[PDB]
């Protein structure tokens, strides 16, 4: 179960619960203030009191600790842990309080896109943020607009400074890698086909995420693996032959081709809605085709070929940045 807490209640004599920020499958996240940071507001993740979620949070904390000792002064746009503790079996982590995540704001705007300069700056942050993560033997395994926070989402949102949050899935290079790892919508072909994954996973997701920013809607609105693959093929091109010879999950294929009932409800859905990636472009200017060229390289089927965030940052699309955007 959860925790015995209403508003005004105190934790460890530092925080007072002023209200709820959200609640999920892991526990609560509440808004607070601090005695010793004096007046200071924080989001306070509070993991439930069950064995498995506890041991899990611990691993997460280890991640946030590592993030907090490389990012010397904090130029890398990761959510900052300000404190953690074991408040009676419920692991608790104090994060610095931020705005709404890039998806709420998109929902509140009735799912209509951020303009290109908005995207371009968010992409820039995202690449930069995760490249920092990747050069420290990490993979966030759960990127998705819900997990990217605006520092402040005053509204067009006034300031496109963002943060990456919820490292509850971040995995180190030594650690055991689970077979399946992303959010269905942001999950790369190598994971669907169970070919092992690592950092490139993140880049695939990031592509999906930038698509969603630019158009307002999820790129792979799907629920089953087979459909998901078919969407991939229609939008990005045929799945590279060596990836099919190399896959255990052959149920999805026949004679090196995807098995698909085009007349099924998902078949018809795909035919009506899924189009080549180029054709989802709004305008044909340069700063648009550049963005899409980036996205396509981010959505390379083959994770050994897929561009890296270190390479992504050397892209002519980012040329369109404000020098105050630049840092
Ligand atoms: O996991 C983290 O690192 C994490 C870290 C910080 C926040 C967060 C999740 N979620 C917030 N929002 C939120 C919104 C809906 C549901 C839930 Cl459970 C939480 C939030 C808000 C303001 N400042 C920091 C955060």
Numbering used by the authors: 142 to 296, 310 to 481
Q: What do the authors say?
A:
CLKs are dual-specificity kinases that are activated by autophosphorylating their own tyrosine residues and subsequently phosphorylate the serine/threonine residues of the SR protein. The overall structure of the CLK catalytic domain contained 12 β-strands and 10 α-helices that could be divided into the N-lobe and C-lobe, which are typical forms of the kinase.
The active site environment of CLK3/CX-4945 was also similar to that of CLK2/CX-4945 except for the valine residue (corresponding to Val324 and Val326 in CLK1 and CLK2, respectively), which was replaced with the Ala319 residue. In contrast, CLK3 did not have the entire β-hairpin insertion structure due to its flexibility. As described in the previous section, the hydrophobic valine residue (Val324 and Val326 in CLK1 and CLK2, respectively) was substituted with alanine (Ala319) in CLK3.
